[PDB]
Symmetry: D4
Amino acid sequence: SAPVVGIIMGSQSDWETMRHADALLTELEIPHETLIVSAHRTPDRLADYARTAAERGLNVIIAGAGGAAGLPGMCAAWTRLPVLGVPVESRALKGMDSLLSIVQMPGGVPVGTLAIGASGAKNAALLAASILALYNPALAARLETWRALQTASVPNSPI
Amino acid sequence: APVVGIIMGSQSDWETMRHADALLTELEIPHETLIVSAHRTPDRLADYARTAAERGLNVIIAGAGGAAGLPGMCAAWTRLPVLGVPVESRALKGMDSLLSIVQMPGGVPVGTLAIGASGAKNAALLAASILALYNPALAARLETWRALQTASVPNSPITE
Amino acid sequence: SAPVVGIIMGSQSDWETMRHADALLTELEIPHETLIVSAHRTPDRLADYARTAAERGLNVIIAGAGGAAGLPGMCAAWTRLPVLGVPVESRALKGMDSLLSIVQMPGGVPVGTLAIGASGAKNAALLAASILALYNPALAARLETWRALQTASVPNSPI
Amino acid sequence: APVVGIIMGSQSDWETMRHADALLTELEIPHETLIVSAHRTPDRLADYARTAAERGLNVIIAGAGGAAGLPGMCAAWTRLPVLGVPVESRALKGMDSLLSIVQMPGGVPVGTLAIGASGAKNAALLAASILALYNPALAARLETWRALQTASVPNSPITE
Amino acid sequence: SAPVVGIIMGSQSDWETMRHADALLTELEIPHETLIVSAHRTPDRLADYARTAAERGLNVIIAGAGGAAGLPGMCAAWTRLPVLGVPVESRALKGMDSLLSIVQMPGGVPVGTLAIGASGAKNAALLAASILALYNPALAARLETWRALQTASVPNSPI
Amino acid sequence: APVVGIIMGSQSDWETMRHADALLTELEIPHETLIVSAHRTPDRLADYARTAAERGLNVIIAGAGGAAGLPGMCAAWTRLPVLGVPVESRALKGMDSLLSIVQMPGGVPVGTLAIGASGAKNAALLAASILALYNPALAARLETWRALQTASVPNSPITE
Amino acid sequence: SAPVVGIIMGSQSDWETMRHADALLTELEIPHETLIVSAHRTPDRLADYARTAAERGLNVIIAGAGGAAGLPGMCAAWTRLPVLGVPVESRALKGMDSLLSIVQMPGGVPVGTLAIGASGAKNAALLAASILALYNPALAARLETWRALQTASVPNSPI
Amino acid sequence: APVVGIIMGSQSDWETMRHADALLTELEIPHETLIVSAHRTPDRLADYARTAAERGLNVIIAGAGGAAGLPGMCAAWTRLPVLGVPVESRALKGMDSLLSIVQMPGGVPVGTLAIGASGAKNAALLAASILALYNPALAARLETWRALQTASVPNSPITE
């Protein structure tokens, strides 16, 4: 019932991308919360969210943002929990700025980065699932089924 | 018994991956370090990745330069979380390494870290934070490590 | 009758691009098979496909994929046959990620890479044709005709 | 009392940021130079940026390499103008630094300068031009400095 | 009444982007002028504009241009006033050329550069506002209110 | 009699192309190595490419740096498969070389390999795999070479 | 009457871009020819065109192509005349491949390169005009008028 | 009397621009070489570019690194053809130089050459080919130079 994964994003504009992470966690029945937390516009909200995440029972945080995406990095700065970052595609630079702003974290504060866009949001949720599966047998079985179905469902020839 | 597996495409990757090895040892996390080439020893990778979970591994840290493809293929065969470290390449300075690792299609994740030594160290720290979720002793050591890092940052530069 | 060229792609989404390779081989009457084989979602299917390709009579493999396109490289890892790679255009990075993930193969396992997109798929088929033409006189003549017609058909002035 | 604050993520950034320090001193602009890590000392940054205005600072010059994120987060907490200096990185030569600093979302500005030493010097000059708007003495010194720069450019290269 | 901020752009095509800077200054009630001044097509107009800016009472200049955007740099070359540059998104290179042509100013002549596009235009105006606020108490209070409202208005969850 | 032609724009390309030469010799594949400049000796290239097939060549390996354009123009004149090797350039590290070679328009193919030495070696290996399709003896030597490469990969890095 | 400028392009697809060079030369009343000459598909046609250009009275050649654009460089390889290159925007890489393939000519064989796209085609024609103006007084006056009108026509404020 | 003007932003550009100077002298083309900074000496540039035609110059070769903007602004003030040479920059290896020079808006052309020494040499050769259009003696010298370049290309690399 209590969320074990927190999905946060810099703004409503990131939802089109982050909704894919939400859908995947729901699919695997992983309790989670989905919120908007801006490192740049609501820094104190982020500070509070990140430093109290562990105490609240969260195990993994999935953070998405575009452009000079400082959200994932700053979230990781305040929590000891694993932080996964999703580079949201930006209008001009197609997420290259988002990607470098998230993945190039200096040594000492990590952010596990996924692909730019929807695929990355989906994979952040799957990566979070694989993490939780390490100590949740039931979920591990559901993840195995998910991966197995993915593999078995790939067509043999194009239509 | 190892709970983290550090794999790389060749000896040339060790200069970078040794930083992940050192950090895990520092946090007292048992691990194994191997060379597994996705392109030169594809069957070795298949076997390694396929059996990782049953062998007791919880996290795999894979390093690759250029288009080596090691992290992605490891993730294709294991249900375990796979972290990728882009090893700096001669011509493209790791940009090819980075894109070839992070741009995984939806369905097969690879948590990617920064290009080079920083990425290797952070891959180990990320692995540590994952393991700490269910290992109180490690969680305490990680907390101490993170707190020390914060307390050790100087307040002013040596402007001499 | 038996296929001598195998066209494989990571997913149905790659078909819009790889269909150009299919059309060209058919045009030159080169027997081939067209399949979906995902290195990431169906690794064992790829292992089987690539290691048995030569035994099955295939002479050249054309592999297309986008993003962190590991398909061409892994196919080349399991077969001694020439592997040609087609970088499929990706949404965000326009195939630059596809290109680097295919062309930057470390020494020891080659992948002959073509241009990003439809042009690359067409050229992979033409390159495969030029390879087969080295030991198939009839096909060599048809390829000569194809190249000759291409050259002769270029307009002298724009419309 | 300092009117400009120069902050950077680590001692490694000093090689670049010292150029901003030198220029401010040259123009007789009182300032402070500190190391504040957005990722390693987030609360130190929060406090620094939040209290900058009340402490008398008018402009903040922040340097960062890679994805350090220092300039952006400083700007998030202060109403003061924040100038960012992309510090050259090993692999991507400051391109990651540049994009991570300049591409701020609408609503939270960071005036960004060139990658490296030139950017640090220009950040100080930009800060100087801002302060000169309400400091006649400084305005005169800046005018003299700009005029001297122009008058000092050689007319021909030493072609020997 | 007299303008204290000058917004200049290379051409009418830049207006779609620079209008965001105009709107923000008006919102904060900052007197300003908005003009088209091309460094490449009207060099003498730029020379006159920039060298006389200070005398006319301007305190900050916001310059926007795309491609080989020389406007911001040349404006800064002629004035002692702070010059802020806005990289306008270009058709082919998505503003990467605009960005490098503005931000990479050699030491000695600065241009405070903002993000590519509309966000950059808005932020140039906000940065100009933060500069003027240093010596204008009333404006400083309005800027505080603007920043406070921005922070308070961020939703807590996506729709 | 040569069955593979290795051509390059200048002596400066040899440092890279020599790797293709060495690999072909290792696999006992007769070949010729020449300097042919698309831009400085356009007619030499026209003649070389036009007559390659009648001279007995089966595959051409062309190396070029920057915008040299050698691989593409060779392919324009020959019906033979042409493989391109991007030679690393000083400023753009071979990125200009790579794009100028791989982005051929539909209708005129150039099978492109990696930037630098790895690409040169792989161009030779690719040429070898093409020739092996109709040369049993070579096919056996290639099989042995590939198998040896796989068997020679170390299982663990020298972590000393 | 006889053409003094030759505009050549790799294919009909380049016309949308190169037509801007054609329009400008016509505007300035500069006799010219506009043809399709493909370095890759019609190499011999290019060889003949370029080596005989000077003999035919051409003074400047404007060559446009996209992707691995070898047309400008190869044209310059066969003629002593000044060759100006126009990078045509490519689908995937937005002309970055076109640009590098044209501008990065090794020392010894130059190609004066213009901007990617329509602007580049227009400027190639203007650059050709400025070259011809050096020894054609009447044209020099028309070019002066063209440049003067361009400068005088720039609006002072956006609409 | 000079017919070509070679201008650059600073002494640091000379290492690159000297190649244009040498080539013009080789072809016996009278020219002048000056340092003119678009950003540091804007009025010097205005005067230089504005009066170039009346002073007898037929072509201007301008070199710039980063965002110096010299070629574009020179072209803004002169009706003469302006050729631009991107000088290699420290961090971005001339990519910033290249884009800042070649991406001129329609209406104000700058014929751009390759990044670095090759571009400087080619700018001089391009200027030479322009002048040769109305100078028979020079046309003959250029023809001889181009023919010699072609005849001097070696047929095979020194494979020792």
